[PDB]
């Protein structure tokens, strides 16, 4: 009758794939903390966020956008951040096409959109939805829900396989998923080429529900920050594509929130269906949120100055 920690793991890949690399880690977490740690999977990232909102998920590995939603809607708090095994300070979003495709660039895709099928990402994905949503779509005034022959919304792994198998022409993806696919399904990775790469996205945070007990919070902090001390733990980390965990907080999300608001604002400005007053009202509201955010960001950068 040892207390249970439900650990949410976002659907970047199939649960079967995730278990093979997550189970050794959760077993170590169980041993070190004295809790029974059980994986919580879902079909999409929303399942983890909503699970946390109703206290079915205690702690989770999220991407940055899902962490933002968890903080805003699911009583979440960031306490740690993953660091790439390579030492990279983050990862990147990709657009992928099949190696046989004549689409070889963002311009080729946009120029030919009406003839193409597009695999968009999970709507709570940073690399799969938000990042390309802004840099590829909003900035170029092309709406993925209208521009293509057909669109889908799928996990990273489902998009990669759909492009590999010639079911979708272009899809969103990311560099961490690519490395994983290269390991688990090299025959599929061999069918893929990268036609676009985003700016750097910061490392994924770990988030807990803020009503977790003090004892659980403290033992979890101790576990994450001390992990990687020996060969066994180093192997676990490497298989998860990490080198270590470091301390973080909700302010990790400030630039993510900025990108989210840049996207929403540009999407509203681009929307030719809106009336003059309806548009002006929405943009005023969004610009006030951006002003408040950028003041907070300025405060944080100036305290690092002085
Ligand atoms: Cl699955």
How do the domains of the chain map onto residue ranges?
1-89+203-249, 90-202, 250-306
Same CATH fold assignment for domains 1-89+203-249 and 250-306: no
Residue with tokens 């002003």: 291
Say which experimental method was used: X-ray
DSSP per-residue letters across 36-96: EEEEE--SSHHHHHHHHHTTS-SEEE--HHHHHHHHHHS-EEEEEEEEETT--SEEEEEEE
Tokens of 80: 């740690």
H-only helix segments in the chain: 15-33, 45-53, 64-73, 106-111, 131-132, 156-164, 175-184, 186-189, 214-226, 231-239, 254-270, 276-305
Q: What angle do CA 39, 43, 46 make, to 5 degrees?
A: 90
Tokens of 161: 């396989």
Into which CATH architecture does domain 1-89+203-249 fall?
A: 3-Layer(aba) Sandwich (3.40)
Q: Please give the CATH number for the structural domain made up of 90-202.
A: 3.40.190.10
Looking at the DSSP bridge assignments, the partners of residue 7 are 39, 59
Q: Output the CA 144–ligand 1 centroid distance in Å.
A: 26
Q: What is the resolution of this structure in A?
A: 2.0
Q: Output the CA 11–ligand 1 centroid distance in Å.
A: 8
Q: How far apart are CA 105 and CA 251, in angstroms?
A: 34
DSSP class of residue 2 equals P
- Distance from the Cα of residue 4 to its chain's centroid: 26
User: Which residues make up the environment of ion ligand 1, defined by Cβ < 5 Å?
Assistant: 14-15
Q: How far apart are CA 115 and CA 292, in angstroms?
A: 42
CA-based nearest residue to 191, from 211, 210, 168, 207: 168
Q: Output the CA 49–ligand 1 centroid distance in Å.
A: 17
Q: 250-306 has which fold?
A: Methane Monooxygenase Hydroxylase; Chain G, domain 1 (1.20.58)
């Amino acid at each position: 009758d040892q207390p249970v920690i439900n650990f949410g793991i976002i659907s970047t890949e199939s649960s079967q794939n995730l278990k093979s690399i997550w189970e050794p880690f959760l077993k170590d977490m169980s041993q070190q903390t004295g809790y029974q740690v059980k994986a919580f999977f879902a079909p999409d990232y929303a399942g983890i966020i909503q699970g946390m909102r109703f206290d079915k998920v205690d702690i989770a590995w999220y991407g940055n956008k899902a962490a933002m939603e968890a903080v805003d809607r699911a009583h979440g708090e960031i306490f740690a951040q993953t660091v790439a095994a390579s030492g990279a300070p983050g990862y990147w979003s990709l657009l992928i096409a099949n190696k046989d495709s004549k689409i070889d660039s963002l311009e080729d895709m946009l120029a030919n959109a009406k003839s193409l099928t597009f695999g968009n990402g999970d709507p709570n994905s940073t690399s799969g939805y938000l990042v390309p949503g802004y840099y590829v779509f909003a900035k170029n005034n092309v709406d993925p829900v209208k521009a293509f022959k057909r669109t889908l919304n799928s996990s990273h792994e489902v998009n990669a396989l759909a492009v590999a198998n010639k079911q979708v022409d272009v899809a969103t993806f990311n560099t961490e998923g690519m490395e994983r696919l290269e390991l688990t399904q090299p025959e599929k990775a061999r069918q893929l080429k990268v036609i676009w790469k985003s700016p750097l996205i910061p490392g994924d945070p770990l988030v807990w529900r803020n009503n977790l007990s003090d004892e659980q919070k403290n033992k979890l902090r101790d576990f994450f920050f001390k992990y990687g001390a020996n060969a066994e733990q180093k192997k676990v980390l490497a298989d998860l594509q990490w080198s270590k965990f470091q301390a973080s907080d909700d302010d990790q999300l400030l630039p993510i929130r900025q990108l989210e608001l840049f996207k929403q604002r540009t999407d509203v400005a681009n929307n030719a269906n809106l009336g003059a007053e309806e548009k002006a009202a929405k943009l005023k509201a969004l610009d006030e949120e951006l002003a408040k955010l950028e003041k907070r960001m300025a405060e944080r950068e100036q305290k690092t100055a002085a």
